[PDB]
Design a protein around this ligand. Structure first.
Ligand SMILES: [K+]
Ligand SMILES: [Mg+2]
Ligand SMILES: [Mg+2]
Ligand SMILES: [Mg+2]
Ligand SMILES: [Mg+2]
Ligand SMILES: [Mg+2]
Ligand SMILES: [Mg+2]
Ligand SMILES: [Mg+2]
Ligand SMILES: [Mg+2]
Lengths: 126, 206, 86, 137, 164
RNA sequence: AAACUCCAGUUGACACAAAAUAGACUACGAAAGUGGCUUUAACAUAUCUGAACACACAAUAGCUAAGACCCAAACUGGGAUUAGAUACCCCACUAUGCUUAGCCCUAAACCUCAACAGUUAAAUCAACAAAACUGCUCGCCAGAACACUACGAGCCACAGCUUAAAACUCAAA
């Protein structure tokens, strides 16, 4: 179909989010996407579909190191399109919106609070 | 502000300038040479190169101020320091031979340690999101906890249940209590660390 | 079923490194195309869709290789300017 | 001697031994990692069942069966009941690409068994039966 | 008669607390001329007793009321349209009886008087059913009413009641 | 949740079903189509063009007789779901997808490019598509809608297929 020129030129939402989360975890479980992505051991927290189905935000858990965070971000952004293609080719969903990988830092508050709470002085009776 | 943005704050430290040129690193040498070009604000009334200058006590005195009356605030501070010193000497004379090694008589050490014993490490931020109000724990910055220690001490010493007891005497008693991890200010720190322990689950609302 | 067991798709553990053996097995199954076959066989892909997908993949690979070749060929010129100023 | 990634051949004599036994005498842990369940069966080299554990036999119900923790618990239970019959070394045969593919092996290791080889036996037809249609979600 | 205005689609959206024109999941006939045409094809309704199903906004209800009916029984499943139908009833005193319930389970044989019951062999018994329901509900309803006609019970205790 | 518990796991025996990888190949056939292995037959024509109807073929769906039935699956039941739920998810199971002998004769049956022969020089050339043309032949087309329609005729087709109008209307399409 002249490929050269082509290249040259709500309850439902929750079920879809759960399905996409499972599919994305299973995709990241192997070197199917890429060996470099597989070696990074990316863990996903959740998947959120925008109300108009215009983007799929996959929230990935960040680590403590910053160079590793930047590298994982770069690899995920470079691999998003291939993962979308795989999701549509495996017929998990007939149409998948563009995949956006967003960092998740919610657990940082709990982590730091517990760290300080360990060394805090509550005095008598705790 | 009557000062131009060009004006930089002065550095009153007296031993900083006496540093031999050999000890200066190239960054420090560059900074010193830069300071020649810059305009410097007039050093405010207050901090001095005096060897007895103590910024913490100066801040405490400024926080006790009412209506710009610095003479009276400093009078109360020096009276408190003298009262603490005299009480420590009185307890030192009447102490046994072995108990005189564990009595601190320096009122400055007592003041600093008492304020350090009242600093909370975790505090709360008032946040209403879902139509109902929610406290959430947060880590307090060092400045914030240093401020809270002094504010709690002053508010406790300004209580009305102390009828006709003069401020230097009240403050000396509270400082000597907090030096030994006692009193209502330490209890206020503990009731904050505990009531922020009861709300760890809300910490995900940050 | 009729074949001998413990020959196909079998990996030995080196010095008790079970994780490394499992990851090596995952790599072998991936590059042999077995993982994609298993995942694509879960639901039936219609023949027209299958043909379109293969055509798209082949032409995507060809186009990407040509673009990479062009970029690498033109990379040689990316050096310091020898006639700076003029 | 260079380590051989390839398994030993029954015919070709080899020096590799595990507690005095040859490769073809080691017990086999069969893991079936489905999408909603993981089942582990330990059998002897002569195909005599020694232990069995699934996520459902360990109390997990409905969606909780299809998690890593449930498969790990099933692996630990199978490893305990196989240890009680003299099993130390095992050959792992994994079938399926479910969530418990690796967690079951982890549970077996934490239960005390030593994995000497990993084999994949996931069913791959050479285009036999027709799969079901895609879900129109 | 002075009847209140037909609700607009914006008012319907706000009443259903949807805040959008995409989550409606329902179609309405908010044109009184088409409803007049439908009620005209339903026949002569002068001093007739009409059983209305699935009114919603009430265009069919208004068109029936404009026809000189005797009493209009209106069964609605969604409570949120009941205030509008109550305003309609206040406009027309005594001509409108609003009931909340499912048409699939509502019992019509008791609604009207027993003096309207005519023999099966006679003409239709001055009782009419009119309905613009969701297409997911009209097929079960017509199957149920076909069974009732076979048994000459339910809405057809009154006789050969006509349906539109 | 229903369903099954004559259930499930290992091992052994075991299709009238479908043919991983090779294939990142681009082949064969008039087209439709054709991608597991072996063997037997076997892929017209030494000018070209030449048919709605002549003579032979035509994916999928559909219909007669018989058979096979793993899996899939229009319909048909059941489970779960808002406030008129999910047509959509889950379970079970038909016609049908398969073989044999006959029908039916339709596709975005498309490279949306009629067959043969020739040219690359010209102003290349409305646009886009797929560079622009020449010779010769057959087929077809002359505003829109009425109309993949009505009537007539033909057909193993019986509200089916092929051929295919007119009136009224409009200034557009
Ligand atoms: K085409
Ligand atoms: Mg010819
Ligand atoms: Mg002709
Ligand atoms: Mg055919
Ligand atoms: Mg057929
Ligand atoms: Mg069948
Ligand atoms: Mg021709
Ligand atoms: Mg015309
Ligand atoms: Mg016709």
């Amino acid at each position: 179909k002249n490929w050269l020129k082509k290249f040259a030129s709500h309850a439902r939402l929750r079920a879809l989010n759960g399905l996409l989360y499972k599919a994305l975890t299973d995709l990241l479980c192997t070197p199917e996407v890429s060996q470099e992505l597989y070696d990074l051991n990316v863990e996903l927290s959740k998947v959120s579909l925008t109300p108009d189905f215009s983007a799929c935000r996959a929230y990935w858990k960040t680590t403590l190191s910053a160079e590793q965070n930047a590298h994982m971000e770069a690899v995920l952004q470079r691999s998003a399109a291939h993962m979308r293609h795989l999701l549509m080719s495996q017929q998990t969903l007939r149409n998948v919106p563009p995949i956006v990988f967003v960092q998740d830092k919610g657990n940082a508050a709990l982590a730091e609070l517990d760290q300080l709470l360990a060394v805090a002085d509550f005095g008598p009776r705790d | 502000s009557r000062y131009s943005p060009e004006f930089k704050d002065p550095l009153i430290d007296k031993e900083y300038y006496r540093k031999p040129v050999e000890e200066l690193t190239e960054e420090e040498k560059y900074v010193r040479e830069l300071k020649k070009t810059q305009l410097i604000k007039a050093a405010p009334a207050g901090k001095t190169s005096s060897v007895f200058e103590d910024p913490v006590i100066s801040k405490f005195t400024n926080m006790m101020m009412i209506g710009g009356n610095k003479v009276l605030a400093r009078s109360l501070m020096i009276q408190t320091l003298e009262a603490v010193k005299r009480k420590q000497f009185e307890k030192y004379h009447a102490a046994s031979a072995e108990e005189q090694a564990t009595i601190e008589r320096n009122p400055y050490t007592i003041f600093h340690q008492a304020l350090k014993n009242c600093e909370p490490m975790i505090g709360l931020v008032p946040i209403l999101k879902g139509g109902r109000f929610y406290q959430v724990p947060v880590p307090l910055p060092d400045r914030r906890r240093r401020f809270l220690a002094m504010k709690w001490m002053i508010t406790e010493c300004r209580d009305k249940k102390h009828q006709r007891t003069l401020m230097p005497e009240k403050l000396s008693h509270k400082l000597l209590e907090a030096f030994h991890n006692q009193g209502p200010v330490i209890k206020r720190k503990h009731d904050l660390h505990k009531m922020a322990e009861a709300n760890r689950a809300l910490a995900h609302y940050r | 079923a009729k074949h001998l067991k413990f020959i196909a798709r079998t990996v030995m553990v080196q010095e008790g490194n079970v994780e490394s053996a499992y990851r090596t097995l995952n790599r072998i199954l991936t590059m042999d195309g077995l993982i994609e076959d298993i995942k694509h066989r879960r639901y039936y892909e219609k023949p027209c869709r299958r043909r379109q997908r293969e055509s798209y993949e082949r032409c995507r690979r060809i186009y990407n290789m040509e673009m990479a070749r062009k970029i690498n060929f033109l990379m040689r010129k990316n050096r310091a300017d020898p006639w700076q100023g003029c | 001697t260079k380590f051989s990634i390839y398994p030993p051949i029954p015919g070709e004599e080899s020096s590799l031994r595990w507690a005095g036994k040859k490769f073809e005498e080691i017990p086999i842990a069969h893991i079936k990692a489905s999408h909603n369940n993981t089942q582990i069966q330990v059998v002897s080299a002569s195909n005599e069942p020694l232990a069995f554990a699934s996520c459902g036999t360990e109390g997990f119900r409905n969606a909780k069966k299809g998690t890593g923790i449930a498969a790990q618990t099933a692996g630990i239970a199978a490893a305990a009941r196989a240890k009680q019959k003299g099993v130390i070394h095992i050959r792992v045969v994994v079938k399926g690409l479910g969530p418990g593919r690796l967690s079951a092996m982890h549970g077996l290791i934490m239960g005390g068994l030593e994995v000497i080889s990993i084999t994949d036996n996931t069913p791959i037809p050479h285009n036999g039966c027709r799969p079901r249609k895609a879900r129109k979600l | 008669c002075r009847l209140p205005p037909l609700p607009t689609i914006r008012e319907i959206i706000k009443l259903l607390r949807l805040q959008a024109a995409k989550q409606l999941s329902q179609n309405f006939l908010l044109d009184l001329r088409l409803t007049d045409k439908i009620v005209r094809k339903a026949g002569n309704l002068t001093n007739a007793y009409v059983y209305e199903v699935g009114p919603g906004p009430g265009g069919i209800t208004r068109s029936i009321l404009n026809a000189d009916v005797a009493e209009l029984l209106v069964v609605e499943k969604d409570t949120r349209f009941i205030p509008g139908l109550q305003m309609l009833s206040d406009a027309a005193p005594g001509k409108l009886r609003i009931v909340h319930g499912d048409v699939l389970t509502f019992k019509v044989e008791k609604a009207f008087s027993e003096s309207l019951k005519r023999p099966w062999e006679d003409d239709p018994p001055n009782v009419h059913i009119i309905g613009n329901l969701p297409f997911s509900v009209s097929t079960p309803l017509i199957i149920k009413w076909l069974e009732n006609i076979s048994c000459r019970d339910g809405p057809f205790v009154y006789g050969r009641t006509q349906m539109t």
